[PDB]
Coordinates of C-alpha atoms in Angstrom, one line a residue:
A1 CA 82.7 80.8 55.8
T2 CA 81.4 77.6 57.9
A3 CA 78.5 78.1 60.6
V4 CA 81.4 77.2 63.0
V5 CA 83.8 79.7 61.9
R6 CA 80.8 82.1 62.0
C7 CA 80.0 81.0 65.8
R8 CA 83.6 81.6 66.4
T9 CA 83.9 84.8 65.0
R10 CA 80.8 86.0 67.1
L11 CA 81.8 84.4 70.0
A12 CA 85.5 85.9 69.8
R13 CA 84.1 89.6 69.4
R14 CA 82.2 88.9 72.7
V15 CA 85.3 87.6 74.6
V16 CA 87.3 90.7 73.4
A17 CA 84.7 93.0 73.9
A18 CA 84.7 91.9 77.7
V19 CA 88.1 92.3 78.5
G20 CA 88.8 95.6 80.5
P21 CA 91.3 98.5 80.4
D22 CA 93.2 96.9 83.1
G23 CA 93.9 93.9 80.6
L24 CA 91.4 91.6 82.8
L25 CA 88.3 89.7 82.1
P26 CA 86.2 90.3 84.9
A27 CA 84.9 86.7 86.2
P28 CA 82.6 87.0 89.6
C29 CA 81.4 84.2 91.5
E30 CA 77.8 83.7 91.7
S31 CA 75.8 83.6 95.2
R32 CA 76.0 80.2 96.9
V33 CA 73.6 78.7 99.3
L34 CA 76.6 77.2 101.8
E35 CA 78.0 80.5 102.2
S36 CA 74.8 82.4 102.4
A37 CA 73.6 80.2 105.2
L38 CA 77.0 80.8 107.2
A39 CA 76.9 84.3 106.8
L40 CA 73.2 84.1 107.7
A41 CA 74.0 82.1 111.2
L42 CA 77.0 84.6 111.7
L43 CA 75.0 87.6 111.4
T44 CA 72.1 86.4 113.5
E45 CA 73.7 84.9 116.3
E46 CA 75.8 88.6 116.7
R47 CA 72.4 90.3 116.2
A48 CA 74.2 92.3 113.4
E49 CA 73.1 93.8 110.1
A50 CA 69.3 93.3 110.1
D51 CA 69.1 94.5 106.5
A52 CA 71.6 91.8 105.3
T53 CA 69.8 89.0 107.4
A54 CA 66.5 89.5 105.7
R55 CA 68.1 89.8 102.4
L56 CA 69.9 86.7 103.0
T57 CA 67.0 84.8 104.4
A58 CA 65.2 85.7 101.1
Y59 CA 67.7 84.6 98.9
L60 CA 67.8 81.1 100.8
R61 CA 64.0 80.4 100.7
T62 CA 64.0 81.7 97.2
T63 CA 67.0 79.6 95.9
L64 CA 65.6 76.3 97.4
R65 CA 62.0 76.8 95.8
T66 CA 63.4 77.5 92.4
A67 CA 66.6 76.0 92.0
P68 CA 68.0 73.7 94.8
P69 CA 71.7 72.9 95.1
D70 CA 73.0 69.5 96.3
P71 CA 71.5 67.7 99.2
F72 CA 74.2 68.8 101.5
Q73 CA 73.9 72.5 100.8
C74 CA 69.9 72.3 101.3
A75 CA 70.6 70.6 104.6
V76 CA 73.0 73.5 105.6
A77 CA 70.0 75.8 104.5
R78 CA 67.3 74.2 106.0
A79 CA 69.3 73.8 109.5
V80 CA 69.9 77.8 109.5
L81 CA 66.6 78.8 108.3
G82 CA 64.3 76.9 111.1
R83 CA 88.9 64.4 106.0
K84 CA 86.0 65.6 103.8
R85 CA 83.2 63.8 105.4
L86 CA 84.7 65.0 108.5
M87 CA 84.6 68.6 107.5
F88 CA 80.9 68.4 106.2
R89 CA 79.7 66.5 109.1
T90 CA 81.1 69.0 111.6
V91 CA 79.6 72.0 109.3
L92 CA 76.0 70.5 109.8
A93 CA 77.0 69.6 113.5
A94 CA 78.0 73.3 114.2
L95 CA 74.6 74.3 112.7
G96 CA 72.7 71.9 114.9
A97 CA 71.5 69.5 112.4
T98 CA 73.4 66.2 113.6
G99 CA 75.8 65.4 116.3
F100 CA 79.6 66.1 116.2
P101 CA 82.1 63.5 114.9
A102 CA 83.6 61.3 117.9
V103 CA 86.8 61.6 116.4
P104 CA 90.6 62.3 118.2
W105 CA 90.9 65.9 118.0
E106 CA 94.3 65.6 115.8
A107 CA 91.9 64.5 113.2
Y108 CA 91.2 68.1 112.5
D109 CA 94.8 68.8 111.9
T110 CA 96.0 69.0 108.5
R111 CA 99.2 70.0 106.8
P112 CA 99.8 74.0 106.7
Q113 CA 100.8 74.0 102.7
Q114 CA 97.2 73.9 101.8
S115 CA 96.6 77.1 103.6
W116 CA 92.5 77.0 102.9
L117 CA 91.8 73.9 104.1
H118 CA 94.1 74.4 107.1
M119 CA 92.2 77.4 108.3
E120 CA 88.8 75.7 107.7
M121 CA 89.7 72.3 109.5
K122 CA 91.2 74.5 112.5
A123 CA 88.1 76.8 112.7
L124 CA 85.7 73.6 112.6
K125 CA 88.2 71.9 115.4
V126 CA 87.1 74.8 117.6
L127 CA 83.6 74.8 116.7
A128 CA 83.6 71.2 117.5
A129 CA 85.5 71.6 121.1
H130 CA 83.0 74.1 122.0
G131 CA 80.1 72.5 120.7
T132 CA 80.6 69.4 122.8
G133 CA 81.6 71.4 125.9
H134 CA 85.0 70.9 125.9
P135 CA 86.4 74.6 125.1
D136 CA 89.6 74.0 127.1
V137 CA 90.8 71.8 124.4
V138 CA 91.4 74.4 121.9
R139 CA 95.3 75.3 122.0
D140 CA 96.8 78.7 121.2
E141 CA 98.1 77.4 118.1
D142 CA 94.5 76.9 116.4
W143 CA 93.3 80.3 117.5
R144 CA 96.4 82.0 115.8
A145 CA 95.7 79.9 112.3
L146 CA 92.1 81.8 112.2
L147 CA 94.0 85.6 112.8
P148 CA 93.6 86.7 109.0
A149 CA 90.0 86.3 109.4
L150 CA 90.0 89.4 111.4
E151 CA 91.7 91.7 109.1
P152 CA 89.6 94.2 107.5
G153 CA 88.7 94.5 103.7
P154 CA 88.2 91.5 101.3
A155 CA 88.4 88.3 102.7
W156 CA 92.0 86.1 103.3
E157 CA 92.8 84.5 99.7
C158 CA 89.3 85.7 98.5
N159 CA 87.7 82.9 100.1
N160 CA 84.7 83.7 101.9
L161 CA 83.8 80.3 103.3
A162 CA 87.3 80.3 105.1
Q163 CA 86.6 83.5 106.8
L164 CA 83.1 82.8 107.6
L165 CA 84.3 79.4 109.3
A166 CA 87.1 81.0 111.1
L167 CA 84.6 84.3 112.2
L168 CA 82.0 81.4 113.6
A169 CA 84.6 80.1 115.7
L170 CA 86.5 83.4 116.6
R171 CA 83.4 84.9 118.1
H172 CA 83.6 82.2 121.1
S173 CA 86.6 83.6 122.3
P174 CA 86.6 86.9 124.3
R175 CA 90.2 87.6 123.6
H176 CA 89.4 88.2 119.8
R177 CA 85.9 89.6 120.3
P178 CA 87.3 93.4 120.1
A179 CA 88.1 92.8 116.2
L180 CA 84.8 91.1 115.3
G181 CA 82.4 94.3 115.0
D182 CA 84.6 95.9 112.0
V183 CA 84.9 92.6 109.9
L184 CA 80.8 91.7 110.0
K185 CA 80.3 95.3 108.3
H186 CA 82.7 94.0 105.7
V187 CA 81.3 90.5 105.4
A188 CA 77.4 92.1 105.3
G189 CA 78.7 94.4 102.4
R190 CA 79.8 91.6 100.0
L191 CA 76.4 90.7 99.4
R192 CA 75.2 90.4 95.6
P193 CA 72.2 91.9 94.0
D194 CA 70.2 88.8 94.7
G195 CA 70.7 89.2 98.3
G196 CA 73.4 86.1 98.4
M197 CA 77.0 85.6 99.5
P198 CA 79.5 84.0 97.0
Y199 CA 82.1 81.6 97.6
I200 CA 84.8 83.4 96.3
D201 CA 85.5 87.1 94.8
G202 CA 85.9 85.9 91.5
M203 CA 88.5 83.8 89.4
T204 CA 89.9 86.7 87.2
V205 CA 93.3 85.5 86.7
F206 CA 91.9 81.7 85.7
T207 CA 89.6 83.4 83.5
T208 CA 91.9 86.1 81.9
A209 CA 94.5 83.2 81.2
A210 CA 92.3 80.7 79.6
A211 CA 90.4 83.6 77.6
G212 CA 94.1 84.7 76.4
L213 CA 95.1 81.2 75.4
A214 CA 91.9 80.5 73.2
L215 CA 92.3 84.3 71.6
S216 CA 96.0 83.4 71.1
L217 CA 95.2 80.3 69.2
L218 CA 92.7 82.0 66.5
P219 CA 94.1 82.6 63.1
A220 CA 94.8 86.3 64.1
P221 CA 95.1 86.8 67.5
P222 CA 93.7 90.3 68.7
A223 CA 95.9 93.0 69.9
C224 CA 94.3 92.8 73.6
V225 CA 96.5 89.6 74.2
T226 CA 99.4 91.9 74.9
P227 CA 97.7 93.9 77.9
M228 CA 96.1 90.8 79.2
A229 CA 99.2 89.2 79.2
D230 CA 101.0 92.2 81.1
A231 CA 97.9 92.0 83.8
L232 CA 98.8 88.6 84.4
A233 CA 102.8 88.8 84.5
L234 CA 102.5 91.7 87.2
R235 CA 100.1 89.4 89.4
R236 CA 102.7 86.5 89.5
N237 CA 103.5 85.4 93.3
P238 CA 107.0 85.3 94.9
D239 CA 107.4 81.7 94.1
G240 CA 106.9 82.3 90.1
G241 CA 103.1 80.8 90.4
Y242 CA 100.0 82.3 90.0
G243 CA 96.5 82.4 92.1
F244 CA 93.2 81.9 90.7
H245 CA 92.2 85.9 91.5
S246 CA 93.9 89.2 92.4
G247 CA 95.5 88.9 96.0
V248 CA 95.6 85.3 96.3
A249 CA 99.0 84.0 97.6
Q250 CA 98.5 80.3 97.2
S251 CA 99.8 79.7 93.7
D252 CA 98.5 76.3 92.0
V253 CA 99.3 74.2 89.2
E254 CA 96.5 74.5 87.1
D255 CA 96.5 78.5 87.4
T256 CA 100.2 78.3 86.3
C257 CA 99.7 76.2 83.3
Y258 CA 97.1 78.6 81.8
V259 CA 99.1 81.4 82.1
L260 CA 102.3 79.8 81.2
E261 CA 100.6 78.5 77.9
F262 CA 99.4 81.6 77.5
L263 CA 102.3 83.7 77.9
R264 CA 104.4 81.2 75.6
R265 CA 102.2 82.0 72.7
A266 CA 101.5 85.6 73.0
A267 CA 104.7 87.2 74.8
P268 CA 107.3 84.7 75.0
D269 CA 109.8 87.4 74.7
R270 CA 108.2 90.4 76.1
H271 CA 107.5 88.0 79.5
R272 CA 110.4 85.9 79.4
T273 CA 111.1 86.0 82.9
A274 CA 107.5 85.4 84.0
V275 CA 107.5 82.4 81.7
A276 CA 110.9 81.2 83.4
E277 CA 109.5 81.5 86.9
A278 CA 106.5 79.7 86.1
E279 CA 108.5 76.7 85.0
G280 CA 110.7 76.8 87.8
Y281 CA 107.3 76.9 90.0
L282 CA 106.0 73.7 88.4
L283 CA 109.5 72.0 88.5
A284 CA 110.0 72.6 92.3
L285 CA 106.3 71.2 92.7
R286 CA 107.1 68.0 91.1
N287 CA 106.9 64.6 92.6
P288 CA 109.6 61.6 92.4
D289 CA 106.6 59.6 90.7
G290 CA 106.8 61.7 87.6
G291 CA 103.1 63.3 88.7
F292 CA 102.4 66.9 89.9
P293 CA 100.5 68.1 92.6
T294 CA 97.9 71.1 93.0
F295 CA 99.4 73.1 95.4
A296 CA 102.5 71.6 97.6
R297 CA 105.2 68.9 97.0
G298 CA 104.5 66.0 98.9
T299 CA 100.9 65.7 98.2
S300 CA 99.6 63.2 95.9
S301 CA 100.0 63.6 92.5
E302 CA 96.8 64.1 90.0
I303 CA 96.1 63.3 86.4
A304 CA 94.7 66.4 85.2
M305 CA 97.6 68.4 87.0
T306 CA 100.3 66.3 85.7
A307 CA 99.2 66.2 81.8
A308 CA 98.3 70.5 82.2
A309 CA 102.1 70.5 83.5
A310 CA 103.4 68.1 80.7
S311 CA 102.0 70.4 78.1
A312 CA 103.0 73.6 79.4
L313 CA 106.5 72.5 80.0
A314 CA 106.8 70.9 76.6
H315 CA 107.5 73.9 74.6
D316 CA 111.2 74.0 76.3
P317 CA 113.5 70.8 74.9
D318 CA 115.5 71.5 78.2
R319 CA 112.5 69.6 79.8
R320 CA 112.1 66.6 77.6
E321 CA 113.0 64.3 80.3
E322 CA 110.3 65.7 83.2
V323 CA 107.8 66.0 80.4
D324 CA 108.2 62.6 79.5
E325 CA 107.8 61.1 82.9
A326 CA 104.9 63.1 83.4
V327 CA 103.1 61.6 80.2
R328 CA 104.3 58.0 81.6
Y329 CA 102.5 58.9 84.7
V330 CA 99.5 59.7 82.9
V331 CA 99.4 56.4 80.6
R332 CA 100.1 54.2 83.9
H333 CA 96.6 55.9 85.2
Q334 CA 94.1 55.5 82.7
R335 CA 91.5 53.6 83.9
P336 CA 90.2 50.2 82.3
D337 CA 87.5 52.0 80.5
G338 CA 89.4 54.6 79.3
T339 CA 88.8 57.6 81.6
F340 CA 91.2 58.9 84.2
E341 CA 89.6 60.7 87.2
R342 CA 87.7 63.7 88.1
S343 CA 89.2 66.5 90.5
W344 CA 88.6 70.4 90.4
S345 CA 86.1 69.7 87.4
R346 CA 83.2 67.3 88.1
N347 CA 82.6 66.2 84.5
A348 CA 84.6 63.2 83.2
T349 CA 85.9 65.2 80.0
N350 CA 87.8 67.6 81.8
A351 CA 90.5 65.0 82.7
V352 CA 90.0 63.4 79.4
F353 CA 91.0 66.6 77.5
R354 CA 94.0 67.5 79.7
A355 CA 95.2 63.8 79.2
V356 CA 94.9 63.7 75.3
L357 CA 96.6 66.9 74.9
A358 CA 99.7 65.8 76.7
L359 CA 99.3 62.6 74.9
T360 CA 99.4 63.9 71.5
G361 CA 101.1 67.3 72.1
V362 CA 104.6 66.0 73.2
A363 CA 106.8 64.8 70.4
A364 CA 107.3 61.1 70.7
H365 CA 108.5 58.2 68.7
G366 CA 109.2 54.6 68.6
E367 CA 107.6 52.1 71.2
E368 CA 106.4 55.5 73.2
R369 CA 104.6 56.8 70.2
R370 CA 102.6 53.6 70.1
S371 CA 101.7 53.5 73.7
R372 CA 101.0 57.0 73.9
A373 CA 98.5 56.8 70.8
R374 CA 96.6 53.5 72.1
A375 CA 96.3 55.6 75.5
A376 CA 94.7 58.5 73.3
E377 CA 92.6 56.3 71.3
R378 CA 90.7 54.6 74.4
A379 CA 90.2 58.1 75.8
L380 CA 88.6 59.4 72.5
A381 CA 86.7 56.4 72.1
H382 CA 85.0 56.7 75.4
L383 CA 84.0 60.3 74.3
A384 CA 82.4 58.8 71.6
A385 CA 80.7 56.1 73.3
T386 CA 79.2 58.6 76.0
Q387 CA 78.3 61.1 73.6
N388 CA 74.5 62.1 73.9
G389 CA 72.0 62.0 71.2
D390 CA 72.1 65.8 70.7
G391 CA 75.8 65.9 70.0
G392 CA 77.1 67.0 73.7
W393 CA 78.4 65.6 76.7
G394 CA 77.0 66.4 80.7
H395 CA 78.5 66.0 83.8
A396 CA 78.3 62.1 83.6
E397 CA 77.4 59.7 80.9
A398 CA 73.7 59.9 82.0
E399 CA 73.6 63.6 82.2
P400 CA 72.0 66.0 80.0
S401 CA 74.4 67.9 77.8
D402 CA 76.2 71.1 78.7
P403 CA 78.2 73.7 76.6
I404 CA 81.4 73.5 79.1
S405 CA 81.5 69.6 79.3
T406 CA 81.1 69.5 75.6
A407 CA 83.7 72.3 75.1
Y408 CA 86.4 69.8 76.8
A409 CA 85.4 66.9 74.7
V410 CA 85.9 69.1 71.4
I411 CA 89.3 69.9 72.5
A412 CA 90.1 66.6 73.2
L413 CA 88.3 65.2 69.9
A414 CA 89.9 67.9 67.7
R415 CA 93.6 65.8 68.1
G416 CA 91.8 62.6 66.9
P417 CA 91.0 62.0 63.1
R418 CA 89.7 64.7 60.6
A419 CA 85.6 65.5 61.4
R420 CA 84.0 63.6 59.0
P421 CA 80.1 64.4 58.3
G422 CA 78.1 62.6 61.1
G423 CA 81.1 62.0 63.2
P424 CA 81.6 62.6 66.8
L425 CA 83.4 65.7 66.2
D426 CA 81.2 67.2 63.7
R427 CA 77.9 66.6 65.9
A428 CA 79.6 68.3 68.9
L429 CA 80.5 71.4 67.1
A430 CA 76.6 71.5 65.7
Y431 CA 75.8 71.3 69.3
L432 CA 77.7 74.1 70.1
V433 CA 76.8 76.0 67.2
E434 CA 73.0 75.5 68.3
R435 CA 73.4 76.4 71.7
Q436 CA 74.8 80.2 70.9
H437 CA 72.5 82.6 72.4
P438 CA 71.6 86.2 70.5
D439 CA 74.3 87.9 72.5
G440 CA 76.9 85.6 71.0
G441 CA 77.7 83.8 74.4
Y442 CA 76.8 80.6 76.1
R443 CA 74.8 79.9 79.3
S444 CA 76.1 76.6 81.0
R445 CA 75.9 74.5 84.6
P446 CA 78.9 75.3 86.2
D447 CA 81.7 72.7 86.8
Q448 CA 84.3 74.1 89.2
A449 CA 84.3 72.7 92.5
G450 CA 85.4 74.4 95.8
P451 CA 85.7 72.5 98.5
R452 CA 85.4 69.2 96.2
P453 CA 82.7 67.9 95.3
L454 CA 80.8 71.4 96.1
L455 CA 80.2 73.3 92.8
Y456 CA 80.2 77.2 92.4
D457 CA 79.2 79.3 89.4
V458 CA 81.7 81.6 87.6
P459 CA 79.5 82.2 84.3
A460 CA 82.5 84.0 82.5
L461 CA 84.0 80.6 81.9
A462 CA 81.4 79.3 79.7
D463 CA 82.1 81.6 76.9
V464 CA 85.9 80.9 77.5
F465 CA 86.0 77.2 77.4
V466 CA 83.8 77.3 74.2
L467 CA 86.1 79.7 72.2
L468 CA 89.2 77.7 73.6
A469 CA 87.3 74.6 71.9
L470 CA 86.2 76.4 68.7
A471 CA 90.0 77.6 68.1
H472 CA 91.2 74.3 68.8
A473 CA 88.8 72.7 66.3
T474 CA 89.1 75.0 63.6

């Protein structure tokens, strides 16, 4: 067939072969400078694990010399070797690279429903209190939030950044020091082969669900979608949502939407109850303005999360009213230049493909069809306007192309007009065909941020989103 179908067949063989007997696509996270530097400071100060401190040191010098990250991580690494503005300032101040923010102590107090950030902010408040010479400011309720960091085994919520920050604060408290020695050995045992510390354990639920959705969109889905659907359903949280990895109690809208869309196609009867629980999770999260937050109701709705929820809930005609209110939220927030806004992904094309899917996926007629089509046209027009010469897109309009940013654009463009020769979609598919590597896969710069806008690299996502693009476009 075409070179695109040939490329799609080769990539699908690779994704299927990577799924394990347990029905999961392994998706480890690469080492990151910020957490490696925090692990280096924690172990150095506790005078523990000399083998890991040397490997962490060699990793940091090598990474700065051959592949330096954002300026913030470089300064964090350099300080160790030799609300979000408040969090990053306090981190650098805790390492001695700047002064502590002269803010009221309540600025570090955040809502508990964002569990990861809540523990992170509490640890930095403790570090700021001790760092400025006011240890007596720390309340008992502040210490109690960091208690999960002293539990043995993998990091609480698979978040190495959260545990490292909480441990750096807990070592200042003699009441919590008895439990510090054991976890220090667990922390030092997490080093990747390159001597670095990953941000998270992985993203296996997110990756398996996105891979299964792509496989279920092929002309003939492989049989492995059933054990993949089983492995996802048995990992659901009590509230019906899904975390990004095994053992993540904080469900989120993005992970739930990918699982829900996958289960809807590959096992709507086999996992009828899991499907119903995920829809109930999304609807209990919905905001009165029609949008959807990321984690907890009462926090700000987001375009990407609202569009993803609109597409996921659109399969049930019982939910036509909530789905239409969500799509209207998307139209209401389209920028004057046709874009929407970044979020968990750092490229512009991500929110574009989520919005276009909701705009062209939900059945609509009359005045609403006109309004939704015009919003979809302006979004697809923004893609064609910012397309690079080689046929791909980057993180931003002037950035070099990468397969993942281009994959998002292809999914959006696949809902537009037919691919004519030389058209924007045709050249995008040709860019993806050229960038396929002999082993059948793709290697791309990462686009996931956490904590925003700090990037982290889960390499297995390159193959998954490119396959999702090729399945949508063929």
